[PDB]
Design a protein around this ligand. Structure first.
Ligand SMILES: NC(=O)C1=CN([C@@H]2O[C@H](COP(=O)(O)OP(=O)(O)OC[C@H]3O[C@@H](n4cnc5c(N)ncnc54)[C@H](O)[C@@H]3O)[C@@H](O)[C@H]2O)C=CC1
Ligand SMILES: NC(=O)C1=CN([C@@H]2O[C@H](COP(=O)(O)OP(=O)(O)OC[C@H]3O[C@@H](n4cnc5c(N)ncnc54)[C@H](O)[C@@H]3O)[C@@H](O)[C@H]2O)C=CC1
Ligand SMILES: NC(=O)C1=CN([C@@H]2O[C@H](COP(=O)(O)OP(=O)(O)OC[C@H]3O[C@@H](n4cnc5c(N)ncnc54)[C@H](O)[C@@H]3O)[C@@H](O)[C@H]2O)C=CC1
Ligand SMILES: NC(=O)C1=CN([C@@H]2O[C@H](COP(=O)(O)OP(=O)(O)OC[C@H]3O[C@@H](n4cnc5c(N)ncnc54)[C@H](O)[C@@H]3O)[C@@H](O)[C@H]2O)C=CC1
Ligand SMILES: O=C(O)C1(C(=O)O)CC1
Ligand SMILES: O=C(O)C1(C(=O)O)CC1
Ligand SMILES: O=C(O)C1(C(=O)O)CC1
Ligand SMILES: O=C(O)C1(C(=O)O)CC1
Ligand SMILES: [Mg+2]
Ligand SMILES: [Mg+2]
Ligand SMILES: [Mg+2]
Ligand SMILES: [Mg+2]
Ligand SMILES: [Mg+2]
Ligand SMILES: [Mg+2]
Ligand SMILES: [Mg+2]
Ligand SMILES: [Mg+2]
Lengths: 328, 328, 328, 328
């Protein structure tokens, strides 16, 4: 209905694509755009990555020289230091440009207003949904994969066609799909998943273990095998990915289905509440402030929590165990 | 009783007044002090404003050169960037001075400790209560207007006479009045008005509209005419300004007076509570911290809220309407 | 979309329009209908107003004689004594009529069932949204202005065309607009504005003053200048009327915008609650009962509240002040 | 300090005093003013009272004829029907007057706005504090007694001297005293005593009896003797009147003093709350509305409560008892 499946590849010919960063996403996006018939250069600071990106053939300059040559740029770099870079190097050059297309992999720095490029620029988003590595395995098979798209500002009337051109340039289509959206509807999710259903999982596990041991008299080496020290989790995750979330449960016995569904519908509101709270905290722009300040202070809380979890009890016992199974 | 009406104009003769900034307040204060028989220079950075302030005759240097020549300075500039300026340019020069008089239009940066000048300085406040423009219309008529005054530090024994000298130098007296106060009793109000009775007004309106439409089946184009899209508001505001707040209501019918007064006395405590909370939040110095940090982060929340209100529903409908009345 | 801009002026020719009352709305409506080519008479009791309405040329009889001659009547009189009049004089005459058109400026007496005319009558509403005076200034410029319309009962199939005919007869269109609605959706608003966002404003102000003085040690003569004794209010009301409610705030500094918006979104629910309560109190018809009874008792509460507010503290100090600025 | 003890008796000579009503207060006030050297007439409707007031020498006309002759009037009649009378008869005559002095015994009808005389009238209050009868016994002894005074409106500059003239005209001074006050501070008390400490007394007694009987197994004929069927109450009331409220308790044993004082200080707040609530209910003007409406409906609730209390249990048993002691 609203899930674009393919487009043309016209605009990006006659132009040069200067890519920034050569990390996880950078490598594959670069190689794919190259293999699909596009001229490319690369921009990165002179470190270990520089040698490699040079190795694979790309003609590499440093950043400003790169943006100066391209009418397009893929800012494939972290979500934290982008601000400093944009303010030190790029913007001075942006003002020196006429028509320029800016693409990101994440809108955390845009949606929340931390960047405000000129009006003479085409602003867009291209959001892969993958770890980054397996994309290669999915590529050699010729299969595409999903992505999200959106615009924040356009002064050329043709932002979307450039967006889809790139969508093809990375091979995620055809074969996969590409959704159209906004920056907000992307960061919102990328953070909701991180704030709501993941940490709750971790806490539930950490609590079941502690309860069992300290109250019902269980041995530590036992629980961990049942809870996560076995591959059960990833197996059922795969069943979800392929066969469906709910239809998955048939492979389990009824005695499991009943106890699962009853509770699922029993403890639903309790977490809906939490999700509402957190989503509202985000939509307003608070979390960005929180994180930015913690950056401006020295990552104290980060430090203390990383010390606690690792120096917790469950982690100690798990270390003993892994030490016992021959693993790391 | 304690509302000074006029004083003498002695101290500021034989001295030079170097004014900083030439914005809204700067223009009129400058012109008035000039027309009342005082030598003046002007201090501003080389931008658009510089050309104009030069146009109107004032001999303009840049800031440091200005403060170096005057025994007095009127820091008529925003309430946010004053800190950076004072720390970069002025203080080095303050230490080079012997007797200097510092005047402001707002004490937000002083009362909350963000500035701490030397002990060899006369610190004062002069607070006009006007938009800035209409002061001219009130001046040509020869009428004064009200102001607030106060001191934070004095090492000359004669701060108040300089204060009143200036009070005359801007023409707000005689004809108007001048109150004596402190910096705190000024910022406190300038912020209470912004935090308590204004936003409550806006929220009440925004809520009445939403309720009417979404629940009682009203058309959007209708409400806005009753609530604020008509000039009712400013009319009664004027009646308040001139004839009195309460006596104003006679012009309205009784059926309005009853329903207004009963509720006024019904919902009084509810807002007294809020006002207490906010005033306490201020007196302590929290809001200053909040705002300063939000400045040090990139105005995220500012951004998101400005996006919400504008992209709300009421604003959309109002835009359609104004588009329909031929206005902007 | 649903905002009529003009119609024809056919039905009201060959007929006579007998107007009742000659107060604020009566004068201008009368003069305009006369200047747009319509025969008119006037109905009022023999008091001061009678002499004037006669002065301006209108051939005046007393009421019953007027309704007897016209097929239309504009009941431009208060919202309180209309009942007594309708029951004493008009209804006896209504029964003597064949086809008659009844128009009001407010539906408080209709929507709430206090009047129930025959079935042989055309019932309509015409609701100007103005103080009444400025309409003249808006008329000489040829500009129209907004109004609300609606029907309660029709036995002629052509109520709406008479409504629009009148809409033109008063000059509010063209140039302005005219909305279509019901009686309820009119009184509801005319009362919500009086019950919710006005008295809350007054109470917030009255509370800020009291708090400041009695707790934080401020002088009375000071606050009033900041809160309402200055023309700030009407200025920003005008900015709302013209440039938009929210876009208005740009002229203020950021430090104001932040503190305003955060709170606006913080204290929203608190007042939504109140608005719901009051709107429900109205929709049901309670307030009408309350007011009618208080009329049948002698306006005691009215009396006591008017004594309190005037004999309050804030009003005393404001009287001293106005006495000090040379105003009344 | 502020307790007038005597004044002169000048103004009321050369003038005629027309008194209204001849009930409890009327008789003694009339006779006293006559015995102190003043001309008097009387105003009352033609009923039983008329014959008597004529008997005692007073030259009696009916009301309007009376007010027409006097420059003063004492409206010694109930607090309920005064409105009807004032509106039917007096006001038409008031407008026919030049200088007139209006005195009352209670301000319930004034303070609460139920009467609004012209501006050409001297309005005052004179409030005896007595049953009405014992005043005679206190008069023959030559002793005065206390009263309250106040003004609501004066257009003669000499209201207070007329007030004190009357204060002497009724003999309550000298020997007694006269306080100066307002109408509000009079009705407020006359109603607080009726609403707070009296009914609480009655309820406490009614509850002790019921509790004792229905729970602790006591006979009805017993309790009533202890609680109120004995003269204990009036005895200690007299001790209060004469020797002091607290010093009274010495005559009782310590075992009583302890249990009384501890509880007095234990249950203090509980009733302070109630008193606040009721006083606020009054100050606002609600009770007046309540009562007026109940008058306009037919005294239903009055009826039902009078039926309940009388047809209660305690009253039945008390009737049996009084029937047993030979009393009524
Ligand atoms: N698994 C993943 O990491 C995925 C990445 N993304 C998005 O792509 C971007 C990052 O992806 P990757 O680069 O592949 O992961 P990454 O975290 O390994 O990125 C490291 C790269 O950042 C560059 N870099 C780091 N610090 C720099 C600095 N101060 N100055 C200049 N360059 C610096 C380095 O050249 C390095 O190659 C983010 O926006 C992320 O949201 C989206 C899907 C998942
Ligand atoms: N309607 C108003 O704006 C009123 C102003 N005030 C107070 O006066 C001061 C501001 O008044 P206005 O200047 O008339 O309004 P404004 O906001 O238009 O001030 C703009 C002026 O600030 C100068 N300026 C801005 N940024 C600068 C920077 N980085 N470096 C050097 N100069 C800079 C500019 O020369 C410009 O002329 C504030 O303290 C305010 O509280 C008091 C009453 C109301
Ligand atoms: N600013 C305003 O007053 C506006 C008026 N309206 C509506 O129009 C009507 C009133 O408007 P206006 O007359 O202009 O204001 P108004 O309150 O000055 O009306 C006074 C008129 O009512 C007449 N009148 C008063 N008592 C009377 C009585 N016992 N018997 C016969 N006639 C009596 C008088 O002739 C007098 O001319 C109301 O329905 C009101 O809701 C609508 C918009 C605003
Ligand atoms: N124990 C008391 O009754 C005291 C009386 N007062 C105040 O004095 C006034 C009443 O005092 P009293 O007359 O002595 O008690 P009251 O209740 O016995 O008054 C009865 C008198 O009212 C007259 N009256 C009753 N209905 C009338 C009507 N429709 N039209 C014309 N006249 C009518 C009658 O002539 C009758 O003589 C009240 O304002 C009361 O607050 C003050 C202190 C106590
Ligand atoms: O792993 C589980 O939870 C099983 C169950 O008892 O349902 C064994 C399959
Ligand atoms: O604007 C209002 O609220 C009015 C009322 O009904 O009281 C018309 C004057
Ligand atoms: O400080 C502020 O934002 C101002 C106000 O009037 O509230 C403009 C001076
Ligand atoms: O009447 C009482 O309450 C007494 C007591 O026991 O204190 C007998 C005096
Ligand atoms: Mg993420
Ligand atoms: Mg994710
Ligand atoms: Mg401010
Ligand atoms: Mg202000
Ligand atoms: Mg109204
Ligand atoms: Mg209104
Ligand atoms: Mg009483
Ligand atoms: Mg009493």
């Amino acid at each position: 209905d609203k899930t674009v499946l393919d487009a043309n590849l016209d605009p990006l010919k006659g132009k040069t694509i200067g890519v920034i960063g050569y990390g996880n996403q950078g490598r594959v996006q670069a190689t794919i755009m190259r293999e699909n018939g596009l001229n490319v250069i690369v921009g990165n600071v002179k470190d270990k990555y520089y040698e490699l990106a040079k190795k694979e053939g790309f003609e590499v300059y440093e950043i400003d020289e790169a943006v100066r040559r391209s009418d397009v740029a893929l800012l494939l770099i972290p979500d934290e230091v982008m601000k400093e870079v944009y303010e030190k190097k790029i913007a001075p050059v942006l003002q020196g440009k006429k028509e320029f297309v800016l693409d990101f992999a994440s809108g955390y720095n845009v949606a929340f207003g931390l960047i405000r490029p000129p009006k003479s620029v085409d602003t867009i988003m291209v959001a892969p949904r993958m770890v980054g590595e397996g994309i290669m395995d999915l590529h050699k098979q010729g299969k595409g994969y999903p992505v999200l798209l959106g615009v924040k500002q356009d002064a050329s009337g043709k932002a979307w066609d450039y967006a889809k051109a790139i969508a093809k340039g990375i091979g995620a289509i055809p074969g996969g799909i590409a959704v159209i959206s906004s920056f907000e509807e992307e960061a919102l999710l990328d953070l909701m998943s991180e704030h709501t259903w993941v940490p709750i999982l971790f806490g539930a596990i950490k609590a079941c273990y502690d309860i069992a041991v300290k109250e019902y008299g269980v041995s530590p080496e036992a629980a961990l095998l049942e809870f996560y020290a076995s591959g059960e989790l990833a197996e059922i995750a795969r069943l979800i990915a392929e066969e469906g979330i709910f239809n998955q449960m048939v492979h389990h016995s009824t005695t499991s289905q009943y106890g699962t569904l009853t509770r699922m519908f029993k403890y639903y509101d309790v977490v809906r509440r939490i999700v509402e709270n957190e989503a509202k905290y985000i939509w307003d722009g608070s979390f960005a402030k929180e994180w930015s300040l913690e950056q401006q202070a020295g990552y104290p809380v980060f430090y203390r929590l990383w010390e606690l979890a690792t120096q917790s009890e469950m982690a100690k016992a798990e270390k003993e165990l892994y030490k016992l199974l021959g693993r790391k």
